[model samples]
Target: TTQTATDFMEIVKGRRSIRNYDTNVKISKEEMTQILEEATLAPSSVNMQPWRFLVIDSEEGKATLAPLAKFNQVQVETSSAVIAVFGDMKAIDQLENIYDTAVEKGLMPQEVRDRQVPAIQGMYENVPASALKDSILIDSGLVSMQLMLVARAHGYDTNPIGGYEKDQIAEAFGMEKDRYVPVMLLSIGKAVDAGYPSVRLPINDIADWK
Candidate 1:
């Protein structure tokens, strides 16, 4: 049976794209953990947990990053914290780590690990590199949703800013080619302005089931 709704739904359904933030407010470790814990729970393709999160709070550093984001000025200037979410390009290296982790967590056997190696290798060969980028974006989006919900639960606001110069972000973060692919910036804080009513497509217009 599905778990009964808690405050989670209240936060989830009430969440809106927060553009304005109260920079005077700072988040606590507990609040941050609540956001991250849900984010970390996101599913990955083939169990490739290829994600990284970086938090930037310094005004000077934000000024440095603001130019990198190009157009998303709201998050850079008003947010209490800016989170950089990235996906690793070279996630193949995580196989061993995954196998070891799965075994430790009672999800797989060491003998089955050998089987998984060749399977993932075949997947890597057949799947285009672009596929990895798509996976990263999809998984990262889920994390953003969870973060938004968590933020609302705690009476905080969140902004998922997308307009940014990727190359600039990569250079500023010193991200190597194989390491992480920068996705977008997630800003968190108390909201100064409430979002106006936005149009939404009905569920029937968007979803279909056989």
Candidate 2:
């Protein structure tokens, strides 16, 4: 069902951590692409957009990912897809193309691009590897959460799996292990069982006023 403003809030508020799914259900590639395109609208540090996704919908791909995510067997077997999100360490490499395209599209002024591109280049060139990884991880996390909400809006359920073998996930999928840092895995599909509603800490308990 296509979502409208009235139901969009329900989509957000009613999201659940689904584990079991209807194995027979599957998402078409075109719809998945549309979902992902909406997901990439998530903001990033300086618009670098460092998140990368490995969609494990095929049998062979799921099989390859299965053992790597040891404890997430239910999701791997039954969900329509298991998405592995990664943080790209070399995302800064696209600065020129991204800025140039922005200029050509009239989204950014040419002079602004010329000024900011080299400024970001210099900052990244000297940034420590640890700092770069931190930036990408944060950006990747933002997109991952947006992806879950978007999936909900599309009438799908999702489970964010953090209990996976992070070290081996990138290489198993043919990504440059050193450059791609695994963030998390999300299992998405129609739910056979709804997740239990959990409690949250009150705002006073978790936040502080300055």
Candidate 3:
């Protein structure tokens, strides 16, 4: 279920950074699946697609994890759901598998792959996980935006935020150190109030098309 370019542009432009949420509203499993499915189509570098999604629903877990993310009260306590969008930090180390997966799909020949893999490896010899983590965050943030729009299309609202205690959230979730890096917390549900009117710079000021 992919959208045409024009439709996609509409969704992208229509999205807003929502904050207030209806606490009594609940997202159905079916709707959740649709939102996640839309997110799966988000682009990734080297096709690593290393992000993982954790949707929190329980009252206790939400309460426990809320303050950790900077006490965004609406997110940790009021939203119907809090989506933890994380990326696997270890994915960069799996370059060999990434390449092999590429080759196995007949995308590249053995001769070409063999010639290129070593050079790529040498180029990244000293590249730290921090670099990869940053890339993943960028990718995950894009996907999270897509998810937020999907939520909007489904008559829901969302707030993409991170003003929290990252380490504390990680510890509370008991996530393995290398397994995932939280990029953004999506506070989603129905909206109790429309946010302040959208504000943006005009295209002429922000763009310089050739």
Once model 2 is optimally superposed onto the true structure by TM-score, how far is the C-alpha of residue 175 displaced, in angstroms?
Answer: 1.3
Which is superior by TM-score, 2 or 3? 2
- What lDDT score goes with residue 50 in model 2? 94
RMSD of each: 4.3, 1.7, 4.1
Give the 10-residue window scoring lowest on summed lDDT in candidate 2. 1-10
Model 3 lDDT tens row, 1-210 = 222233666666766767777777887788788889987788887666777877887877887776686658766677878888888876656767877877999988878778777876675567787787788888887788778887776777788888877666766877777577878788888777767767779999989988
- Over 1-210, each residue of candidate 2 has an lDDT whose tens digit, in order, gives 333233777878888899998898898999899889999999998899999899899999999988987888998899999999988889999889999999999999999998999999998989999999999989998998889888987878899999899998887887876788889999998888768998889999989999
A best-first ranking of the candidates according to their lDDT comes to: 2, 1, 3
Stronger candidate by lDDT (1 vs 3): 1
Candidates in order, TM-scores: namely 0.85, 0.95, 0.77
TM-score of 3: 0.77
Winner by lDDT: 2
lDDT of 2: 0.89
TM-score ranking, high to low: 2, 1, 3
Displacement of residue 178 (Cα, Å) in model 3 is 4.3
Which candidate leads in TM-score? 2
Clashes of each: 0, 0, 2
The TM-score that candidate 2 achieves is: 0.95
